[PDB]
Structure formats: C-alpha cells, structure tokens
C-alpha cells in the first residue's frame, strides 16, 4: 500500500477553514502565517496581477469587491437552475455565469484579462492555502487529507469537494461529515457507556444535525438531517437588506448598485452581529459609505432577532425529523453539542434549550475548531503509526436513493440513514439500451426530488430466445458517493458492463487542465516571490556598502579618496536606480547586482 505521509484534517468551511494534525498523542490545530488558527475561505485577484488567499484577500474585499471570491461552498456541487444558486448570486459582488448548466465564477485577473473558474477550483485554492499552512508547521510536504463536508451534502456536492482536493494536489482519503467529526472531538475520551448525543452544527452557510450513539470509543450515527443553505451569511443578509431600506428611507439613495458600499456594510454588519452575542447593542458606523457621505446606525439585539426569527426557528424542523427517524424522544437525549460559530448567538442557544424542555447544552468545546479537531483525529488513524484512542465510526447516507418508474414514481432503493458502505442489487429484464435516472430525496414523486444522474447501459448481449437479465448494483461508499455497475446473468466468464454516466461532473480531462492551471499559478507565484526577495538582496547589499564606507573605524578608514568616490557613486547610482524601477524584472535586478559587484570587488580586496 501507499506511504500516505502525514495526513491532515481540513474543515473546509463556507466562511472559514481550519487545518489540524495528529502527532505525539495530541491534536494540534495549526496556525497560519499571521498566527491565526482559522483562515477566511476567501480568494482575491488584485489589479496588480497578484492572487491573494485567506486574510489578505479578505482585507481587500471592500476596495476590490468584484474580484474577491467568497462563499464558494454555497455554489460547489450545484446546477444553474437550483433555486438556492439563483437566490445567492443576487447578493454576490463577483460575476457568476452558467456553463454546462453549472455556475462558474468570472473575474478580472488583471491587465484586462477575464478568467472563469469552477467553484471546485476556488475551493482548491482555499485548500492549497490550508495545505501550505500545514506543510510549514510540519516542515515537510503533504499529499493526503481528510476533508469535512456538511452531513446533508448530496452526491454531487461530495464529489465536487473531492475534486477540489485533487486540483489542489491532495488525495482526499475520507470525506467526513461535520457533526460526526465534532462528535469525535466531543466524545473520544469519554468512558461513560452508551449515551445519546445530539450534535447541532450551525456555521457560516450550512446547518447539520445528527443524532449519534457514543458508547466508549464507538461512534454510530443513527439519523441525520439539515439545511445546506442556511447559516451566518443569511443572518447577515437580512440585516443588510434592512439597513439598505432604512438608508433609502432616510436619504433617498439606493446603494444596492454600488458593491463597495454593500460590502462595507456586510463587513460591519458581521462585526455587529458578533458583538450582539455578548452585548445588547452595537453601533454600525461606516465612514464615506456612499457617494462621499458617512453611514451611522444602531442595531439592538432585539432587532437582529425580529429580522432573523423565521430562520432561527427553522433549525428546529430538521432536529424534529432527526428524533422522528431515531424513534427517540426529547428526554432520551443525554447531551446536545453545539458547534459552528453561529451557535454563539444567544437566541439559537435559547430556542435549543426550550425545544428540549430546559435542558442546558454542552460547553467546553470550541465551536470554531471542533470540526477540524475531529478530522485531524480521523487523519491520525489513517496516518498509520499514531496512538489515538479506540475509534470506531459508523456513519450514514443522508438522502434516500431511488429510480424513476412509469409515471414519475420515486421507486425507493436505499433508504436515508442507511450505514455506509452499503449496496443494493436490482435485476432488470429490459434489453437494448436502458436508461436509469437515479434520484435523491424523501418525496414519493420524482419531480419533487433531486436528480443525481442518468446512467445508460449499452453493453447487453442479444438473445436467441428473448430478453436479457441484468443485475444493476448501486454502491454508496464510505465517503457517501454513489458508484453504479452492472452484469448480465446469461454468460459464463464474459460479463459485459457499459455505464455511460450522463451526469453534471468535472471530467478527468477537465480535472487535468485545472490541476495543471493550479501548478502554473504556483510557479507564477513562486517567481513573483523570487523577483521580490532578489530586489531586496540588491537593496540591502547597496545600503550595507554605504554604511561600511562612511564608517571610519572599519572599511572606510582603509579607503583612499579615489576609491571612496568610486564606491559612493556606484552604490548611490544603484539606489536611486532601484527607487525608480520598482516594476523591473528579475533579470534586471540580477544584472544591476552584478554591475555593482564588478566595481566594488577590486576595491574592497586591497
């Protein structure tokens, strides 16, 4: 088998991402080059050609909103006609365009150049940054990763996250659902017997709920449900829609058309929201908001709640379904674990306490980091030689799979909350070329569920006395992803299997371009780095020589007025040169260094 190296655990979140590693019997959550244990899931393209990621991209959002990309997780794995995609793009500053019926991100990379990106490639960039953050901490290179996804992500969404991993040069070994991961972080070291645990994950863009059983070191997911388009960014968006309206009331101006203004508002709103988790009031002051004029308002916690109460309450609907599916009731639940930054909002904590008749949720557990914590643990296990505690994971598929039948009937195949890996065989007697439409979801009619894909069977052998019997097998792997194979029961030895997979996915050719484009950008970013670092060598060398000459105690007492004048001039010449050619290329600097060394070298060696 493969030497998988150190395996890293990544929480690839909507607004934030987090990387951990298991080593010396301990999880370390890894800080980035700015000393932050979490990293904004942002990428930006500066007018000067530069491609920024994380905190740096985020810090230039309001000065360059149209080419700062964010919330790409809300687009990953979706189609154009998805209602969720069409609602989202109405509040995104960067262009989003259809192609191959998928939403692609279109931006300006600088110098009049337009690039269109698949959300997978934007997520790849975020993951690459997380890879590098780890590689630095370890002092070595990394190739395998465990990556989280929300429990309720469907098949496309899982696959796309995996592809994203690939494009960033990572083998995604295991996709792990976020509440499961958090559960490990909660209940790894627990030795209290079988206890029912409810994990309530509310982050930046997605909502997951799972009921687990945790007996000692054995984790079993009983039931799962959530909303993949519901989170912090939606609370922010309600508070923005409000202040825009308010500002038009009070000033007559509609600021919706100016992305700078909106984005400045988003930034400060978010900051207000956070404050309102520990205060009752927050001033939102934005200087030079619109046209030239300043903005100034107060958001009370009460108002933040009126605006968002429908959304807060809708988190209880999946929590019910979870219990209903678990055949358990509220009093059975031993602990309710909260993860995701959005669970810091008091009203969410309150609605949860009330739903469980006054039961107090669990503290102790960092809601921003827990999900990566658990991923890191699961990475340790996969890294081979690590001393994690006992860990057993049984996790489930979240959505019933079925096929369309006469009428448009969702003829069920694999129920939801089935443990994975699982498979289901199915004999068909249709010959010729049969088309199978698979579907995802709990509704008894096909129209009302999500189309996963269309699988054509072209292989079937032709009979002498008629009709072939084909066994179609639907396997769901440990990651949650469907694979579909076939075999006929008419031939000994020959089994004739042909699956054309008419399905909205990046091809292996498309993935190859995007991987090579990523490798190009790395090389490009590497050379921009060599151009900076060698301009600095020159500039330092020059300044250093200028000290040594003016220093009568060391290298300037040794010089004659002839050689002193020639040194002063050679250095003074190259400095006011460097000051006016900042845009010079790598070879210009290499030359000027060597022009200056030519002259200095004979002189200093006397």
Nearest to 239 by CA among 279, 284, 202, 207: 284
State which of residues 215, 471, 487, 517 lies at the interface with Zn ion (CB under 5 A): 215
Distance in Å, CB of 422 to ligand ATP, minimum: 26
Q: Phi first, then psi: what are they for 283, rounded to 5°?
A: -80, 135
Distance in Å, CB of 151 to Zn ion, minimum: 12
- 94's tokens: 């960067």
Distance in Å, CB of 16 to Zn ion, minimum: 6
Judge whether 48 counts as a catalytic residue.
no
Across the beta sheet with 434-440, what order do the strands follow? Answer: 409-414, 401-405, 434-440, 450-457, 499-502
Distance CA 309, CA 303 (A): 10
Cβ nearer to Zn ion, comparing 65 with 203: 203
Count of beta carbons in the 10 Å neighbourhood of residue 193: 9
Distance in Å, CB of 175 to ligand ATP, minimum: 14
Active-site residue, from 58, 73, 162, 264: 73
Query: Which uninterrupted H or E stretch holds 27?
Result: strand 26-29
Could you say which of Mg ion, ligand ATP, Zn ion, none residue 232 binds, taking C-beta under 5 to 8 angstroms by partner kind?
ligand ATP
Nearest to 92 by CA among 79, 102, 101, 103: 103
> Which of the residues 10 through 69 are near Mg ion (CB under 5 A)?
none
Could you say which of Mg ion, ligand ATP, Zn ion, none residue 169 binds, taking C-beta under 5 to 8 angstroms by partner kind?
none
Active-site residue, from 71, 121, 155, 201: 201
Could you say which of Mg ion, ligand ATP, Zn ion, none residue 204 binds, taking C-beta under 5 to 8 angstroms by partner kind?
ligand ATP
CB under 8 Å to 147, separation ≥6 — which residues?
Answer: 10, 12, 127, 161, 162, 165, 170, 172, 174, 175, 176, 375
> Which of the residues 353 through 382 are near Zn ion (CB under 5 A)?
371
Cβ nearer to ligand ATP, comparing 365 with 604: 365
Distance in Å, CB of 205 to ligand ATP, minimum: 5
Distance CA 70, CA 227 (A): 19
Pairing relationship of beta strands 7-12 and 16-23 according to DSSP bridges? antiparallel
Judge whether 395 counts as a catalytic residue.
no
Question: How would you classify residue 516: left for phi > 0, otherwise alpha for psi between -120 and 50, otherwise beta?
Answer: alpha
Could you say which of Mg ion, ligand ATP, Zn ion, none residue 588 binds, taking C-beta under 5 to 8 angstroms by partner kind?
Mg ion
Considering only the stretches 280-288, 337-345, 463-471, 588-596, report the one whose residues sit in contact with Mg ion under the rule CB under 5 A. Answer: 588-596
Cβ nearer to Mg ion, comparing 537 with 585: 585
3-class DSSP state of 202: strand
State which of residues 588, 590, 599, 604 lies at the interface with Mg ion (CB under 5 A): 588
3-class DSSP state of 413: strand
Judge whether 73 counts as a catalytic residue.
yes
Active-site residue, from 120, 178, 270, 368: 178
Distance CA 52, CA 367 (A): 27
Could you say which of Mg ion, ligand ATP, Zn ion, none residue 344 binds, taking C-beta under 5 to 8 angstroms by partner kind?
ligand ATP
Distance in Å, CB of 543 to Mg ion, minimum: 23
- 597's tokens: 């060394």
Distance CA 267, CA 265 (A): 5
Distance in Å, CB of 230 to ligand ATP, minimum: 9
Considering only the stretches 8-16, 396-404, 439-447, 537-545, report the one whose residues sit in contact with Zn ion under the rule CB under 5 A. Answer: 8-16
Distance CA 166, CA 184 (A): 26
- Should residue 13 be labelled a site residue for Zn ion when binding is judged by CB under 5 A? yes
Query: Which uninterrupted H or E stretch holds 109?
Result: strand 102-110
Helix axes 561-578, 586-604, angle to 10 degrees: 170
Judge whether 208 counts as a catalytic residue.
no
Considering only the stretches 23-31, 72-80, 170-178, 584-592, report the one whose residues sit in contact with Mg ion under the rule CB under 5 A. Answer: 584-592
Distance CA 266, CA 43 (A): 17
Task: Report H helices in 366-484.
Answer: 370-382
Distance in Å, CB of 578 to Mg ion, minimum: 14
Could you say which of Mg ion, ligand ATP, Zn ion, none residue 15 binds, taking C-beta under 5 to 8 angstroms by partner kind?
ligand ATP
Could you say which of Mg ion, Zn ion, ligand ATP, none residue 205 binds, taking C-beta under 5 to 8 angstroms by partner kind?
ligand ATP
Cβ nearer to Zn ion, comparing 194 with 241: 194
Pairing relationship of beta strands 499-502 and 450-457 according to DSSP bridges? antiparallel
Distance in Å, CB of 388 to Zn ion, minimum: 20
Give the binding-site size for Mg ion (rule: CB under 5 A): 2
Distance CA 410, CA 140 (A): 50
User: Do 172 and 165 form a contact (C-beta atoms < 8 A)?
Assistant: yes
Could you say which of ligand ATP, Zn ion, Mg ion, none residue 194 binds, taking C-beta under 5 to 8 angstroms by partner kind?
Zn ion
User: Do 19 and 130 form a contact (C-beta atoms < 8 A)?
Assistant: yes
Distance CA 294, CA 261 (A): 11
- Should residue 11 be labelled a site residue for Zn ion when binding is judged by CB under 5 A? yes
Cβ nearer to Mg ion, comparing 104 with 589: 589
User: Do 198 and 521 form a contact (C-beta atoms < 8 A)?
Assistant: no
Cβ nearer to ligand ATP, comparing 237 with 449: 237
Question: What is the three-state SS of 561-588?
Answer: HHHHHHHHHHHHHHHHHHCCCCCCCHHH
Cβ nearer to ligand ATP, comparing 206 with 396: 206
Considering only the stretches 133-141, 249-257, 542-550, 586-594, report the one whose residues sit in contact with Mg ion under the rule CB under 5 A. Answer: 586-594
**For the chain, how long is the longest CA-to-CA vector?**
110
Residues that bind ligand ATP (CB under 6 A): 11, 13-16, 73, 178, 203-206, 231-233, 270, 273-274, 277, 340-342, 344-345, 368
Distance CA 369, CA 182 (A): 9
Residue nearest to Zn ion (CB): 13
- Should residue 194 be labelled a site residue for Zn ion when binding is judged by CB under 5 A? yes
Distance in Å, CB of 13 to Zn ion, minimum: 3
Distance CA 20, CA 374 (A): 9
Q: Phi first, then psi: what are they for 476, rounded to 5°?
A: -110, 120
Distance in Å, CB of 486 to Zn ion, minimum: 38
> Which of the residues 554 through 593 are near Zn ion (CB under 5 A)?
none
Binding region for Zn ion (CB under 5 A): 11, 13, 194, 203, 215, 371
Applying CB under 5 A, the residues found at the interface with Mg ion are 585, 588
Task: Cite the active site residues.
Answer: 11, 73, 178, 201
């Amino acid at each position: 088998s493969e030497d998988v190296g150190t395996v890293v655990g990544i929480d690839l979140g909507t607004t934030y991402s987090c990387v951990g590693v298991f080593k010396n019997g301990r999880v370390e959550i890894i800080a980035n080059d700015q000393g932050n244990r979490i990293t904004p899931s942002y990428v930006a393209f500066t007018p000067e050609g530069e491609r920024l990621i994380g905190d740096a991209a985020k810090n230039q959002l309001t000065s360059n909103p149209e080419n700062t990309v964010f919330d790409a997780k809300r687009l990953i794995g979706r189609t154009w006609n998805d209602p969720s995609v069409q609602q989202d793009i109405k509040f995104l500053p960067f262009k989003v365009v259809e192609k191959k019926t998928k939403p692609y991100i279109q931006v300006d990379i600088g110098g009049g150049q337009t690039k269109t990106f698949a959300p997978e490639e934007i997520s790849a960039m975020v993951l690459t940054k997380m890879k590098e953050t780890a590689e630095a901490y370890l002092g070595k290179k990394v190739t395998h990763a465990v990556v989280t996804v929300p429990a309720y992500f469907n098949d496309a969404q899982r696959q796309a996250t995996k592809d994203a991993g690939t494009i960033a040069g990572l083998n995604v070994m295991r996709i792990i659902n976020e509440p499961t991961a958090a559960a490990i972080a909660y209940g790894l070291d627990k030795r209290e017997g079988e206890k029912n645990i409810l994990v309530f994950d509310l982050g930046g863009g997605a909502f997951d709920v799972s009921l687990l059983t945790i007996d000692n070191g054995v984790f079993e997911v009983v039931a799962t449900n959530g909303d993949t388009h519901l989170g912090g960014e939606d609370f922010d968006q309600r508070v923005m829609e409000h202040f825009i309206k308010l500002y038009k009331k009070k000033t007559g101006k509609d600021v919706r058309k100016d992305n700078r203004a909106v984005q400045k508002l988003r930034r400060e709103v978010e900051k207000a929201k956070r404050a309102l988790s520990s205060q009752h009031q927050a001033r939102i002051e934005i200087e030079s908001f619109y046209e030239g004029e300043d903005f100034s308002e107060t958001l009370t916690r009460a108002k933040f709640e009126e605006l968002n109460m429908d959304l807060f309450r809708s988190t209880m609907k999946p929590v019910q379904k979870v219990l209903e599916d678990s055949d358990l009731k509220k009093s059975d639940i031993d602990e309710i674990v909260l993860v995701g930054g959005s669970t810091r909002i008091p009203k969410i904590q309150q609605l949860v306490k009330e739903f469980f008749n006054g039961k107090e949720p669990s503290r102790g557990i960092n809601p921003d980091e827990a999900v990566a914590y658990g991923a890191a643990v699961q990475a340790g296990v996969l890294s081979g030689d690590q001393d994690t505690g006992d860990l057993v994971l049984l996790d489930v598929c979240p959505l019933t799979l079925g096929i369309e039948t006469v009428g448009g009937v969702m003829t069920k195949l694999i129920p939801r909350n089935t443990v994975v890996p699982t498979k289901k065989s199915q004999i068909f007697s249709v010959g010729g070329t049969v088309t199978i439409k698979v579907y995802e979801g709990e509704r008894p009619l096909t129209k009302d569920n999500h189309l996963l894909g269309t699988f054509d069977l072209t292989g079937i052998p032709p009979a002498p006395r008629g009709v072939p019997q084909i066994e179609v097998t639907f396997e769901i792997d440990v990651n949650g992803i469907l694979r579909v194979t076939a075999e006929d029961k008419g031939t000994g030895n020959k089994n004739k299997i042909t699956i054309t997979n008419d399905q909205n996915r990046l091809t292996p050719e498309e993935i190859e371009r995007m991987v090579n484009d990523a490798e190009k950008f790395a090389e490009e970013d590497k050379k921009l780095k060599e151009r900076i670092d060698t301009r600095n060598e020159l500039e330092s060398y020059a300044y250093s020589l200028k000290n040594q000459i003016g220093d009568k105690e060391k290298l300037g007492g040794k010089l004659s007025s002839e050689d002193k004048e020639t040194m002063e001039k050679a250095v003074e010449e190259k400095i006011e040169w460097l000051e006016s050619h900042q845009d010079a290329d790598i070879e210009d600097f290499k030359a000027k260094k060597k022009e200056l060394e030519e002259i200095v070298q004979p002189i200093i060696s006397k």
